[PDB]
């Protein structure tokens, strides 16, 4: 489906490409195969991200990466890519709003769930390759709000920083107040506990 | 990782150094040599700098800003505008012109910063190149007053004549390819 859409959206195929024209245009790779080149990259990139956030043609797991310096757009539909969900920031305002959390709060008898949040475009799944092209905020309120200017172009926000820890490390209370090797040791000792 | 900046040198210490000494490895990871100066050279920093220059390997590639291979049929023609003056001065009383002049020209520009840092002399470099390749290379050097340090190199005039009636059609590397090989060898192994 992605290849069909790309053909629709003014992507010249490698076979029909004049060799001279490649130099000034971005190369579009899908699953590691150079499908063709696109003369205007940013419009295509925005359209692809809109489609993924609406879940129309591009599935949520599909990751689009644009390397601006190297003039390459890479789209990976491959399996095995590790992804984490992140909140989406438009302008400097989080897309998640009070109406969404009100619907989620009454999750019973409203049939509003994480899938609805993904479909609404509030959250998105981002793999590491796409993480390289993403400006993230650790905490929304602190970093998004205007201060002494550090970054005014945040594109995504972390849901909560404590989610970086795994299953065994999550049982540690106040992990940030411990030495790191000690957290590593507790992760191993907790597997051997009795219960 | 946890040495100090006081050493100001790469030093292998700890378990790897113990293994190097125990196994008596032919090649240490960081071979080093501590040189103690004899007399006034130890007292004065400038004399120590002289000894340093004597002890540190320097090649033409270190002091060469850029190299260009030109084709100039006539040395008097001076295809490069800049070298007109000193080529004309040298050919006012030309040397080795009687044998011939090789048309292919190797033009080497030497960075003044590196040249003065190592305290090398243009005449010194010319003498070293002349000794290394014998008479097969003819070198023209600018005066130090010139803003750009230029060294002009041509194939041997006797070799250009070939000094042989048969002349052999082998034509090994012609002259341009031979000049490129000469440039690479000079840059890598000049040992000025």
């Amino acid at each position: 489906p992605i290849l069909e859409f790309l053909e629709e959206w003014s992507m010249e195929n490698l076979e029909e490409i004049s060799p001279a024209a490649i130099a000034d245009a971005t190369k579009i790779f899908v699953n590691g195969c150079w499908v063709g080149i696109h003369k205007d990259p940013e419009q295509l990139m925005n359209t692809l991200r809109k489609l993924r956030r609406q879940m129309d043609i591009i599935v949520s797991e599909v990751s689009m990466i644009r390397d601006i310096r190297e003039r390459e757009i890479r789209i990976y539909t491959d399996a095995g890519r590790i992804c984490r969900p992140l909140l989406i920031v438009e302008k400097q305002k989080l897309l998640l709003k009070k109406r969404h959390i009100d619907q989620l709060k009454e999750r019973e008898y409203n049939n509003y769930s994480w899938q609805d949040l993904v479909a609404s475009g509030v959250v998105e799944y981002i793999d590491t390759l796409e993480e390289e092209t993403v400006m993230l905020a650790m905490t929304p309120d602190d970093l998004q709000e205007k201060e002494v200017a550090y970054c005014s172009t945040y594109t995504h926000c972390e849901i909560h920083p404590s989610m970086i820890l795994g299953v065994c490390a999550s049982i540690i209370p106040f992990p940030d107040h411990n030495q790191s090797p000690r957290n590593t040791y507790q992760s191993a000792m907790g597997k051997q506990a009795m219960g | 990782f946890h040495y100090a900046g006081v050493s100001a040198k790469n030093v292998t210490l700890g378990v790897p150094r113990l293994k190097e000494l125990i196994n008596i490895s032919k090649k240490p990871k960081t071979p080093s040599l501590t040189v103690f100066l004899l007399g006034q050279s130890a007292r004065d920093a400038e004399r120590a700098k002289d000894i340093l220059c004597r002890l540190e390997h320097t090649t033409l590639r270190k002091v060469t800003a850029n190299t260009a291979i030109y084709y100039d049929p006539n040395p008097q023609s001076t295809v490069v505008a800049e070298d007109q003056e000193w080529v004309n001065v040298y050919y006012e009383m030309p040397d080795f012109d009687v044998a011939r002049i090789s048309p292919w020209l190797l033009r080497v520009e030497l960075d003044r910063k590196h040249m003065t840092d190592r305290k090398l002399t243009m005449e010194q470099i010319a003498e070293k190149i002349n000794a290394g390749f014998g008479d097969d290379l003819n070198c023209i050097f600018n005066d130090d007053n010139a803003e750009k340090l230029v060294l002009r190199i041509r194939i041997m005039n006797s070799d250009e004549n070939k000094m042989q009636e048969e002349e052999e059609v082998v034509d090994k590397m012609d002259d341009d390819v031979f000049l490129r090989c000469i440039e690479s060898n000079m840059l890598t192994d000049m040992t000025l």
Binding site: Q179, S180 | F1, H2, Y3, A4, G5
Partner: peptide, 8 residues
């Protein structure tokens, strides 16, 4: 975890 000269 301390510094460059110390320990990690």
């Amino acid at each position: 975890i301390w510094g460059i000269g110390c320990n990690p």
